[PDB]
Amino acid sequence: XXXXXXXXXXXXXXXXXXXXXXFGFAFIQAALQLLMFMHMTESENGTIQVGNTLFGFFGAIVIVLGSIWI
Amino acid sequence: QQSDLILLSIGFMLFIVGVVFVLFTIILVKYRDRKTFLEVVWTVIPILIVIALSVPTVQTIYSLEKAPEATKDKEPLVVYATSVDWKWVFSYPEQDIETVNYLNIPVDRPILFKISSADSMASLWIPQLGGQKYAMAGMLMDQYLQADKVGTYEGRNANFTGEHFADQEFDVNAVTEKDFNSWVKKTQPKLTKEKYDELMLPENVDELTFSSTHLKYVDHGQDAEYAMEARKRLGYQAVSPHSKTDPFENVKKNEF
Amino acid sequence: PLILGAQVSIALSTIAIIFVLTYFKKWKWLWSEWITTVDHKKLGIMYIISAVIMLFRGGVDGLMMRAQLALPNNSFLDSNHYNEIFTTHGTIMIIFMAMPFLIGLINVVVPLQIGARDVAFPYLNNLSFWTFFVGAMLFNISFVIGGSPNAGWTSYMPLASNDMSPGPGENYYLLGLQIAGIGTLMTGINFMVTILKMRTKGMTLMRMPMFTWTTLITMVIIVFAFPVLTVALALLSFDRLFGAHFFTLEAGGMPMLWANLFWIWGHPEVYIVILPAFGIFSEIISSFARKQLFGYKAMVGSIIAISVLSFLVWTHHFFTMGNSASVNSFFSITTMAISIPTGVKIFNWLFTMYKGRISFTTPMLWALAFIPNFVIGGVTGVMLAMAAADYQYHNTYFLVSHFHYVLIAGTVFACFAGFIFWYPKMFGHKLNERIGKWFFWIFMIGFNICFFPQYFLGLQGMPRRIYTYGPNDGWTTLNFISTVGAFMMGVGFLILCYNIYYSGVGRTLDWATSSAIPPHYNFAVLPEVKSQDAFLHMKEEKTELYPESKFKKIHMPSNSGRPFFMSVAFGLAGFGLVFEWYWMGVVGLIGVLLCMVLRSFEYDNGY
Amino acid sequence: GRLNILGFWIFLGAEIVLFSTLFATFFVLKNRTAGGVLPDELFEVNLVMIMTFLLLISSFTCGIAVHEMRRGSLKGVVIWTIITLLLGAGFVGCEINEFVHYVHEGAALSTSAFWSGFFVLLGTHGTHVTIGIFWITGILIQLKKRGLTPQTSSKIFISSLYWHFLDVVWIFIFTGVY
Ligand code: HEA
Ligand code: HEA
Ligand SMILES: [Cu+2]
User: Which residues form a coiled coil (chain D) (predicted)?
Assistant: First the structure.
């Protein structure tokens, strides 16, 4: 019931993604996965769970933006 | 040798650190045998050791970019440098001349070395010129040099080893301007069109004067695919055991 | 070729010796209490006993290198042999020596010092040994069966595909490490949860103490700096075999693109070899010294710095390839910001050793020599960070002389420190101390006269990866003195093996076990600890033991024979793709077929 | 209580670096194809691929929340996990026909350096979503002689979140390559 609100809202992000082509377009991609993954991390085993992927995306910025930096 | 002053000056900086830990161990330890505020106050000296180098090094990284040794912004000589396997190739675009495994440059003249490679990555070290630049097969890297004093400068490669790579030592010389102008006007064989393709095979070679520039062939700095049209057009691809000797089909210029 | 004819007969002899002497009947001890065993104590034993095996393989290779490089015009090794021997020497270390030796000292000492039974997933940790072992047999079978790689431990792409030319050369380096990368990745995932959710009551996170903290940081970089190696080789494995053009010179692909992927994994993994080396030395220098590791807000706080700052520095092995200048100063300034979180860690062992007492035993000598020798190498890598001057001493032995001072003093001594300091854990008694000092002195003095002349060899003008130097300004003796010191370290490995032929001032849960060679269940009751150092607070202060009638049930994570068959499938698929089979593999697809069948067996077994 | 929900969770954080390396490779090999075919792919197929996968999680974000956590639809496991299993073959079948149709100029990794990354950045991508089907159907063999209850049969959740991690880079691929 509560998940249907995020699922329906996520579909609008992909539709709005096509309108961008057919920063400003690099944040809607992560925001789509924030709403996608925020319904299943915390808690109990949390903090470590949602924290493990936090510095993981850091390396993704370091690897991608670092390779393009040359 | 512009960055050589960094080497000698930094040597004493770590010579002190090497003896500081001699004082931090040998002074005590022996005396002490059976028979929170210092760490935070220590955070004032460690950057002081690296920030004294995190500025002159950066003031040199940007210094080696623009016009280097002894010239402001005049006398621009260009020398296209290409690296095949084992063997070194240098072509002068100023006048139709190209030398192999040998290079002469006038002293106190800017030289815009266009660095590139043919088949394998390399880099013209030349321990007398200082900084080396990788020979990237696919694009030309600019690197300016000069000559301190008249002499015989040794030269070698970064030596990304591959059977014939330790003997990549090519001798270069730096003479006066008057003697350099008479060197061009004496030589300038020719570009035999086919002998260029006869170079990409890795063996051993002698001087090979060549009084014609080769840059009329796909630039070589671009389109680094000139390794299939090279080794394969003459019918040759090596292996590790047996049946080598350039898999048959001769024509070349070797040693002895 | 003449030399490689004797070893293939000796390799067949060792296999034939196993059948007669050992295989009278082994499906009762080898297949039961070993091979597929689950106890972490036995797994870590098989880890370091393999690294000692690789020490002799990398030893004869490393010795004959400098024996070939004794003086100019020497005709010991030709071109295509000095190229294969020095490449095998570097790859056998770090990957197949320092990695199984450090994790071996981690898969044994770490689970005891936390009070837990085994690890988080003692089943996946079983294959994590054979996953490396089949990758070790893969890389070792390149001796006579195929061909050892000859492109260096880095093995750049433009001299690796067709310009290289040997088919079964780089393939072993590709499939050998690709399998071992899977096992090592799981080794960093097992211990990241073992130290986070299996600690005993009272074992606080900030104090547990510091060596297990370095292991925590060691297994954090493994998780984020090994999937890179998993695809970096997979991309390269597609170029060689399946005909991909990621970095091939022909179809236009970037040749330097494979360099950044290898070094994005390279320098972060470079600390994975020095992090447990720092941890093992952190205890031994603070255990026999009978003091407290003074400094945690700036020592464990300094261990998190190099954990995240290890991925903003990897672009220092380049510099020479003419980058965007500013990006050559970014990673040049940043590299200086990494020798400060590491630099504070040396000022933490000397002030944990002062005011307190000390007694120089064999494990202390490994910690005694670790302090200067690692710094003498560290006071050289600081110069390598200077990109303005890195162009002068890039490669040319001065690079080799820097790191050999950094890693042999750092990890190899830690591999020897943890070898002796935690040898009573492995079996009864320990090493004879007095003749063990003979091994230390000769191995220590030969280490300096081997790589300190290399500092002069490289600065004078001797590049690396060269089989003959030549009479250049009388620089022959410096190359010979380096060889004499190289061969002086060789003398001692006999003493090291002679000491094993014989077959404490604890401050943590090391000697807190019920007896020597601790049992399977390890600790009948879990210690309350509730302090920074458990053993010292559980000795003079009160007593605290394992009282009877307070026992309980067992753990019961018995053995499963699938990890051995699972790693054989990887070894069979990898070997099939390497040894010939250029385009596709007939048996390489079967290994994936056998693996995916066993991955269905993974979630089809109830226990 | 099972720690495999966390142990096989930091592995999902490791695959972020796995796909970031392939994203770093592809983004540097973007301006190549100096000699070959320029990328001109079907637009409507990309949305049909993503909208099927965005509805795949739409039937999976509420596929364990209102399934096992809210109430107890033990009979719906052969309904919600099966319907979401058929959507996994939609991405496999469409990407296979997308690769087969790419044989017409630009086949495999041999035509150009750019197509090497595209077929691999979407290769193990396609392999991860392929083995997930064999993993989601591997747990479906439990409603027979087992039929465990929630908070005990952790096989469903640890494979559901790994299956959810796909849509993370699946959308990042949508903005990455397209
Ligand atoms: C863990 C790191 C590590 C360790 C322990 C060693 C161990 C040794 N290494 Fe090496 N080395 C590297 C890391 C390491 N090396 C790396 C990374 C490369 C480059 C990789 C590449 O690019 O290819 C390299 C390559 C390399 C070079 C540079 C190659 C070149 O530039 O041409 C040198 C220089 O002399 C060298 C020497 C030695 C010596 C003398 C030892 C000594 O420690 C030897 C130790 C030996 C023993 C412990 C056992 C002794 C053996 C015997 C007693 C057997 C005697 C019996 C008979 C001969 C029958 N090795
Ligand atoms: C255990 C592995 C290990 C560790 C810990 C290090 C540690 C360091 N390394 Fe190195 N390195 C290698 C493994 C390692 N290295 C290998 C394998 C190569 C060759 C790879 C190849 O090409 O094959 C290499 C080569 C290498 C390069 C690349 C050279 C090239 O381009 O070819 C660089 C460049 O920055 C470097 C620098 C450093 C620095 C600054 C540190 C610092 O972390 C060191 C920190 C220590 C100190 C800084 C000294 C102690 C500090 C104090 C006593 C405080 C006071 C001192 C100051 C304030 C300065 N080393
Ligand atoms: Cu590094």
Answer: none
